[PDB]
Write a protein that binds this ligand. Sequence first.
Ligand code: SAM
Ligand code: SAM
Ligand code: SAM
Ligand code: SAM
Ligand code: B3O
Ligand code: B3O
Ligand code: B3O
Ligand code: B3O
Ligand code: CL
Ligand code: CL
Ligand code: CL
Ligand code: CL
Ligand code: CL
Ligand code: CL
Ligand code: CL
Ligand code: CL
Ligand code: NA
Ligand code: NA
Ligand code: NA
Ligand code: NA
Ligand code: NA
Ligand code: NA
Lengths: 389, 389, 389, 389
Amino acid sequence: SNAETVAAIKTLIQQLAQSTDQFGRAEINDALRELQYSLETPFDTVMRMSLDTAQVAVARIGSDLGLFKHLSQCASPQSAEELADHLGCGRELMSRLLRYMASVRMVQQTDDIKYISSNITQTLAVPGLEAGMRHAFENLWPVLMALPDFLAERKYPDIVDAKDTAFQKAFNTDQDCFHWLATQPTRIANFKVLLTDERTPNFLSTFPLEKELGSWSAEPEKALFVDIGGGMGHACIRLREKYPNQPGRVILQDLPPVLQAAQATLPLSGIESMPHNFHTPQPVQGAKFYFLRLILRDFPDHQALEILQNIVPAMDAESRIVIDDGVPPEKGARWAETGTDICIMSALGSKERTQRQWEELAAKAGLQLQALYQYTWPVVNAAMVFSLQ
Amino acid sequence: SNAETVAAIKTLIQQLAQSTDQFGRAEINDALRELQYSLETPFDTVMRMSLDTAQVAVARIGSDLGLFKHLSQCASPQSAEELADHLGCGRELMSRLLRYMASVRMVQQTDDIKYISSNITQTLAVPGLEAGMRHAFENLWPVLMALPDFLAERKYPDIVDAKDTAFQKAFNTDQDCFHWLATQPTRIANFKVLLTDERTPNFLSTFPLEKELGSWSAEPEKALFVDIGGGMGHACIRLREKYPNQPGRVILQDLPPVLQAAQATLPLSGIESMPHNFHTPQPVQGAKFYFLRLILRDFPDHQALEILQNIVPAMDAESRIVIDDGVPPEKGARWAETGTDICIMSALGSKERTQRQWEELAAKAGLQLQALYQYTWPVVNAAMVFSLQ
Amino acid sequence: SNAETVAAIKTLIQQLAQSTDQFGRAEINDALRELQYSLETPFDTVMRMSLDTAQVAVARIGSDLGLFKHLSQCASPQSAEELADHLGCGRELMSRLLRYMASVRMVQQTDDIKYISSNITQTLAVPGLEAGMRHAFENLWPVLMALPDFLAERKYPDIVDAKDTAFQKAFNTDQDCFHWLATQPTRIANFKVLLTDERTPNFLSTFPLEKELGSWSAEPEKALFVDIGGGMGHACIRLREKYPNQPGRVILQDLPPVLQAAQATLPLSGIESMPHNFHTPQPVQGAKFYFLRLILRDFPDHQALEILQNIVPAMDAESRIVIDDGVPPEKGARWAETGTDICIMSALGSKERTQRQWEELAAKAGLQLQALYQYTWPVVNAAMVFSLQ
Amino acid sequence: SNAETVAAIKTLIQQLAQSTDQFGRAEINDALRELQYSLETPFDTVMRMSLDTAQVAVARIGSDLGLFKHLSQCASPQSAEELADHLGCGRELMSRLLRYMASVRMVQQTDDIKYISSNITQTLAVPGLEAGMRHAFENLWPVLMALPDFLAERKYPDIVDAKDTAFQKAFNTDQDCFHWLATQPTRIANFKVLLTDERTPNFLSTFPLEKELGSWSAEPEKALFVDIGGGMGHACIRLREKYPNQPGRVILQDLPPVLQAAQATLPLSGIESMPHNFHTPQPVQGAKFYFLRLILRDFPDHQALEILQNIVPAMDAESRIVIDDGVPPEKGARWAETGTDICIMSALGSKERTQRQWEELAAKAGLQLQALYQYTWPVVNAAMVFSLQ
Ligand SMILES: C[S@@+](CC[C@H](N)C(=O)[O-])C[C@H]1O[C@@H](n2cnc3c(N)ncnc32)[C@H](O)[C@@H]1O
Ligand SMILES: C[S@@+](CC[C@H](N)C(=O)[O-])C[C@H]1O[C@@H](n2cnc3c(N)ncnc32)[C@H](O)[C@@H]1O
Ligand SMILES: C[S@@+](CC[C@H](N)C(=O)[O-])C[C@H]1O[C@@H](n2cnc3c(N)ncnc32)[C@H](O)[C@@H]1O
Ligand SMILES: C[S@@+](CC[C@H](N)C(=O)[O-])C[C@H]1O[C@@H](n2cnc3c(N)ncnc32)[C@H](O)[C@@H]1O
Ligand SMILES: C[C@@H]1C=C[C@@H]2CCC[C@H](C)[C@H]2[C@]12C(=O)NC=C(c1ccccc1)C2=O
Ligand SMILES: C[C@@H]1C=C[C@@H]2CCC[C@H](C)[C@H]2[C@]12C(=O)NC=C(c1ccccc1)C2=O
Ligand SMILES: C[C@@H]1C=C[C@@H]2CCC[C@H](C)[C@H]2[C@]12C(=O)NC=C(c1ccccc1)C2=O
Ligand SMILES: C[C@@H]1C=C[C@@H]2CCC[C@H](C)[C@H]2[C@]12C(=O)NC=C(c1ccccc1)C2=O
Ligand SMILES: [Cl-]
Ligand SMILES: [Cl-]
Ligand SMILES: [Cl-]
Ligand SMILES: [Cl-]
Ligand SMILES: [Cl-]
Ligand SMILES: [Cl-]
Ligand SMILES: [Cl-]
Ligand SMILES: [Cl-]
Ligand code: NA
Ligand code: NA
Ligand code: NA
Ligand code: NA
Ligand code: NA
Ligand code: NA
C-alpha cells in the first residue's frame, strides 16, 4: 500500500530527525530536497518551478490580512467563513487561500475542513520573520525578475558594481540599493523589524574568547568589543551574558535610528550605544575586537575594502578584526549559500566569499588571518579573526 | 555517522521509489516535501521562501544562454571556463550561475569542480518543457506579484471575472489575458511551443472505451471523437493509436493558426482538421464523444457554461461530452491542485472545480454525470462522461 | 479560280470568327460541321465514317510516343527522320503517322515536308486534355463497340440500370463501370489526371451570387458553399477567387484519395477538405449552397434521387441545392449533348436530362426549381438552383 | 446576331457549292473541315475525338433495325413511338437514338419532334453504302483499336508484312486478313454487297482510249481489255457502253463466287466472265490492256510485285498494264489518302503509293510508266499505263 509505505517513511525520518541535533536535522532536510529533485518527473520540475513562487505571494496576503497572527492565538479550529468575516476577506477568496495554505503547511486543515495554526503559521506571526518574508516579496523578487533581461541586454557581464546591477532596472533608478531604500519609508520600517530577528546559534558557541584574549588588559578605558553595524546589539548582549565579568568596554555602533530602536531591549548598563557610520574612520582606538557580522557580504570588494580601511588605522598590535559571515566551501556549496550569492549579486552587486576570497580581500587592507571558528553546519558561518600583517 | 545516516536515507528512499510505479513515486515525493516543511526551522522557512524564487530566474537565464541544451549533449564534464567561452557569458558570472545550478540539481558539479547534465538539465533542454518554465517566468510571475496589492486595494473581493483580476494590474491593460496575449508576438511564440508538450499518462490509460461505446454505430458516416480545442491533436493521435480498429470520424477542432501548426505531426490519414471556434455552435452532429481537455478550467462559470451550451444541441441520446480536467477532492487537496487554483484565479479569473462543482456546472447545461475515470494520482485528473439529462 | 474561292472562304470565316466571342465561334463551328454533312456525297459520308475513327487511335499513338509534348517545345520545323530517331519510332512508320496527322491538323506539314505544332498538337500535350483523349480510346470506344450487338441480343431494351448496359459486355464483367474501374490501376491513373482538366467558362461567369445570397448570414460559423464530389476543388478555388470578401465556410467534399490529390494545388487557407461519401447523409448543416457539378448525369434516376435525398435533411429554408450540369433542349439538341447521352447510357446506364426532367427528378426529393443560370452556348450547361418545396 | 451570321454563312457557302462541280465541292468540304479544326477550342478537340466515334456505332444500330431503309420510304414525318413500334425497338431507346441521329444529320428532326429522311438516311439505305459502313464497324474499327498497343509492344516497327500487323492481334489469329475473312460467312456476305457500289467518276472520263490504242488490231481473237479482280465488272460495262464499236474481247476476271454474283447485272453479250486467281499466271496472252483497279493497294510490295509478275509474261510489245488506284502527292496529302494508308497498314500490311513509289514497284517487274491519267481531284485516283521496259 502506497499510503502505508509513505506513512512509514515519515515515521522513520521523524524519529531519525528527533534524535540528532540542529546540524544533523539541517543535513537531513537538504537530503530530502535532493531526493525530491532527483526523483521528480520532467513535468514535476516544471510544475514546481511554476508554482512554488506562489507561496511568497500568498504569505504576503496572509500577512496583509493578519491571518497568521490571528490563527496563532485561536483556541479552537476556525472555519473559512469565520476567518473571512473576522479578517475582512471575501468568503470564497478566503476559502481558496486557506486550502492553498494548508496544502503547503502554512496552516493545517482539519478533517472537518476547519483551520488551525501549523509551525509555519507561528513562524509567519513572529514580527522579524514576517518581515523577512515581506522583504523577499517586495525587495528580492523584483530584482530576480529583472536579472535575466538585464544580463541578456548587457551580453552577460560580470557584475562588480552596486550602481550597475539588476536593482537599477527593477526599480528604475540610478541609485544603489541601500541609498534608494533609505528614501522609502515603508521599506525602512520593514527593515527595522527585520533586525529584531536574532539568528541561532551564534559565534560565542565556538569562539575561544579566553584563548584569543590571552593577557590583554582593559586599562585604561579600553574597549573589549566594538560591534560595527551591530543593529539591535544582539552580539554585545550575548557577549555580556556569557562573560559577565570580563573587563573592557562593550560598544554597539550603528546609525542613530537603529541605535534608537535598540534602546528598548539593551541592558540598562554595560553596553554603550555609539552612533557611527562605518564608511568613516573608526573612533575607538586599540580595541581588542572590532566585530563585523553580516556586514561585508553586502558590499563589492572595493567598498568592503574601504570599510576595513576605515578600521585598520585604529588598531594596535593586539587588536583584531573579527569578520562573522558566510564562508562557503570551494565546491559543493549548499542552496542557501549559492542562492544568497545570486540574490546579493542582483540587488547589491556583492558576492559570497570563500575562505580564500576573504583572505585575499583582507590582505588588501593589510590584514592576515589568525584563526577561523565555524559555528554553523552544513551552511558555513564562521568568526574569522584577522590581525595586522 | 551523520553523513552515513543521510546516505542510508537516500539509498532506502531511492530503492523504495524504484520498488513502485509512477503514482507511488508521486506520493513519495509529496511526503518528502511534507517532511521538509515539518522539520525546517523558522529561519529555514523564511530562507526557503526568500530563495526558491531564484530558481525560475536562473532557469530562464540558462535557457537564454542555451546552457541546458549544450550541457545535455556534452560527452565529458565541462569546466565553468569552457562553458562561459562556448556560450558567450562572463567567466565569473558563469561560474557563479553553475555553482547555484548545481546546488539545486539544475546541473551536477563533479568532484573536480566541472559540470555535467542532471535529469533537470535534460528536462530544461526539451522545447515544450523549457517553454513551460519560460511561461511561468513571463506570464505567471507577474500576475502573482500583482495579486497581494490588487486584493488589498480592492478590499479582498471574490474574483469572478476574467476582465477584473490581477492580470489587469500586472500588465496595465483592461483586456482579459486571452485577448491581450494574442497581441504579443513574443508570448505567442512561446505558447506555440508549449502546446507541443504532451502530458503523460493520459485518459486512454483507464478510459473503458469499448464499454462507453456500447453498440454505437459509426454507420453511415458518424463521428467517433471530436477533440474541441484539441491543440496539436495529441488526444486524436493517441486514440487512433490505441484503438486502430474502431470506426468513426476522428476530428481535431481548433483555431486556424493552431491547426496549421498541428499539420506537421498529424497522421497522414485518419484525423480530420476542422477549424472551429468553440464559442460558436458545434457543427458536428451526433458524435459519440465530444472531448474537452484542459479547456473549461480556463473559464469562469458563465463562460464555461456557454462553451457547454454550444455543444449540447448537437448531441443525440448516445452522444457524451467528456470533460478531461482536474477534479480536486473536497478536502486535503495537494499543492499542485491548489496552486493551480490560485494561479488561474489570478490570471484568468477562473478556478479548479471539485466533482460536485463540475456536476453543478454541467447540470446548468442540461447534462448529467454518467461516469468518471481517474487516470492520475495523487493529483486528480479524470475523464468525466456526461450525457443529456 | 477554285483555289482562290476556297482561300477567300477561309479568310472570311476566320475574320468572322475573330469578330465574335467564344459562343459565336462555337455556333460557327457547328454550322461548318452541318455544312460539311449537307454537302458531302454518299461516298464521302461512308469515307468519313470509315476513317474519322482513326484519329483517336493515331492520337493515342502520338501520346504513347510523347510526340505532341516534344513537337510543342521544338523551336524549328523537324523532319520525320529527326522525330523518329528522337522518339524511338521506325522511320517509315513515323513518316506515315506524321503525314496522317498533318492531314487532320494534329500537326502541321511545312512546304519542305517538315513538321511543326498546331493548336491540336498543343492541346494533346496538356496532361488533362491528353487524358481525355486517352479516356475516349480506352473506356468509351469499347463500350460503343459493344453497344450494337448488346442491343441486338437483348432485342433493344430501354437501358435503365448501371449494372445492365453495354459496359458489362465490353469488359466481360457483371460489375458496374464505377466499381470495375476502381480495380484497374492503369485506368485509375488516367482518371486522376483527367480530374485536373478544368472546364472553361464556369458557372460563376453568370451566377448572380449576391442576388442568390440575399441576406443570408454566415454568423455564427455557417457554410457558404459545400462542393459535393468536388474533385480537385476547382469550383471552391474559383468561388474564393471571384468573391474573396464573402464570409462563410467553403468545403470541398470527396473521397480520401481524391482529397489527398487535391491538396497540392488547394489554397493554403480558406477551403476545407472534408472526406464524405455522397451516398451517405450530408454532414454539413444549413449551408447556403450545396453544389453538385457533373455528378448526377452519371447516375440513373434511382441513384441520382438517393444522392439528392441524402442532402435534403441538412437544408434549412435558405439552403439551396445547385445542380451544375447539362440541360439540353426539348428539341434540336446539339451533337455534343446527344452524343454524351448515348455514351453515358452505354457506359453508366444514365442519361442527359432536359430542364423538365431535372425538375421531375428533384420534385421526387421534395425540391422546387427557383432559378436557372445558363453559362455555355449553344450546348447548354447551367447552374440550376433548387429550394425545399 | 449569331443566328443571323451563321445562317448567312450557310447561305453563301451553299450558293458557292451549287455553282461549282463535284471537284470544287470536294475542295470546299475539305476547307470546311480544316476551318473547323483550326477554330475549335482545346476541349472541343477532345469532345470531337471522344464522340465522333459514336456515329459508326449508331449507324450500325440503325442498319440492324432497318431504320434507314424504312424512313427513306415513308411519305410523312414519323414519331419516335411510331418508329419504335414498327421496327421493334424500346420506345425510350428509339427516341434517344433518333435525337442523336438528327444532331449528326443521319435523319432530320421536324419542329414537332417527328423524323424524316435526310441525304444521309438515303445513303445508309443503299445496300452497297450500308455495307461500307458495316465494314468500317466490324473490320476497320477492331484493327484500329488494336494498333496503338500492337505498336507499343513491338517498339514501333515498320509494318511490312500482311501476316504481322495489327489485324492478327485484333482477331487473335495468325492468318492474314484476306485468308481469315474468307472463313467468316457473314463478313463474306457483307463484302459481296460492298462490290455493288460503283465509284463515280471513273477512269474513262479522262482515258484517251483511241490515242492509247493507235493502230492496234484485235484479230485474231485478241482481248482489248482484261479486268483483273474486276468484281461486278463495272469497268468492262462502262468501257463497252462508251466504246460500243471498238473491236476486241472484253474479259472480266475474278474468283468464281464473285463472277456468279456479277451475272445478274452483266450485259447479255460482249463481256466474257473468266474465273481466274490473280496470284496465278495470266491466261490471256497479248491483250491490249490488263487492268488492275483498287487491287494492288491491298498488298505489300512483295505480294503486289508477285501479282504483276504473273501478268508480265503474257504481254507482247503492244500490251499495257493499267494500274487504276490512288496516287497521293509527295506532300500535302488529304485525309482520305492518309487515313486510307493507316487503315490498310493496320489491316493488310500494305500502303498508299505516290507516283514515284508506283514506278519503283513496277520497275521491279520490268515495267516503265508511259502515261498517267488522273480522273479525280483533290484526292488523286489515276489510270497509270505501263509497258515492258
Ligand atoms: C545585516 S544588518 C547586521 C546586524 C548585526 N551585525 C547582526 O548580525 O546582529 C546590517 C546593519 O548595518 C547597519 N548599517 C548599515 N549602514 C551602516 C553604516 N553606514 N554605518 C553603520 N551601520 C550601518 C544597519 O543599520 C544594520 O543594523
Ligand atoms: C490548454 S490548450 C489545450 C489543448 C488540448 N485540449 C490538449 O489537452 O492536448 C487550449 C486549446 O484551446 C484552443 N483554443 C483557444 N480558444 C479557442 C477557441 N475560441 N476555439 C477553439 N479552440 C480554442 C487553443 O488554441 C489550444 O489549442
Ligand atoms: C466528374 S468528377 C466531377 C468533379 C467536380 N464536381 C467538378 O466539376 O469539378 C466526379 C467526382 O465525384 C467524385 N466521387 C465519386 N464517387 C463519390 C462518392 N461516392 N462520394 C463522393 N465523391 C465521389 C469523384 O472522386 C470525382 O471527384
Ligand atoms: C477492291 S475489290 C476491286 C474491284 C474492281 N477492280 C473495281 O474497282 O470495280 C477487289 C476485287 O478483287 C477480287 N479478288 C480478291 N482476291 C482475288 C484473287 N486471288 N484473284 C482474283 N480476284 C480476286 C475480289 O473478289 C474483288 O472483286
Ligand atoms: C539581510 C538579508 C538576509 C537574509 C536574506 C535571505 C535571502 C538572501 C538575501 C541575500 C539575504 C539578505 C543578505 O544576505 N544581505 C542583503 C539583503 C538585501 C537584499 C535586497 C535589499 C537589501 C538587502 C538580503 O536580502
Ligand atoms: C495549463 C497551463 C500551463 C501550466 C500552468 C501550471 C501552473 C498553474 C497554471 C494555472 C497552469 C496553466 C493552466 O492550468 N491554465 C492556464 C494557464 C495560463 C496562465 C496565464 C496565461 C495563460 C494561460 C496556465 O498557466
Ligand atoms: C465527363 C466525362 C468525360 C468526358 C466524356 C465526353 C464524351 C461523353 C462522356 C459521357 C463524357 C463523360 C461524362 O459525361 N460522364 C462520365 C463519363 C464516363 C464514361 C466511362 C467511364 C467513366 C466515366 C464520361 O466519359
Ligand atoms: C476496299 C476498302 C475501300 C474502302 C475503305 C475506306 C476506308 C479505308 C479502307 C482502307 C478502304 C478499303 C481499301 O482501300 N482496301 C482494303 C480494305 C479492307 C480493310 C479491312 C479488311 C479488308 C479490306 C478497305 O477497308
Ligand atoms: Cl543526465
Ligand atoms: Cl480498436
Ligand atoms: Cl461535420
Ligand atoms: Cl482542500
Ligand atoms: Cl501552335
Ligand atoms: Cl466578395
Ligand atoms: Cl460540419
Ligand atoms: Cl433533340
Ligand atoms: Na475541526
Ligand atoms: Na470528503
Ligand atoms: Na491539504
Ligand atoms: Na420546345
Ligand atoms: Na438536332
Ligand atoms: Na412534322
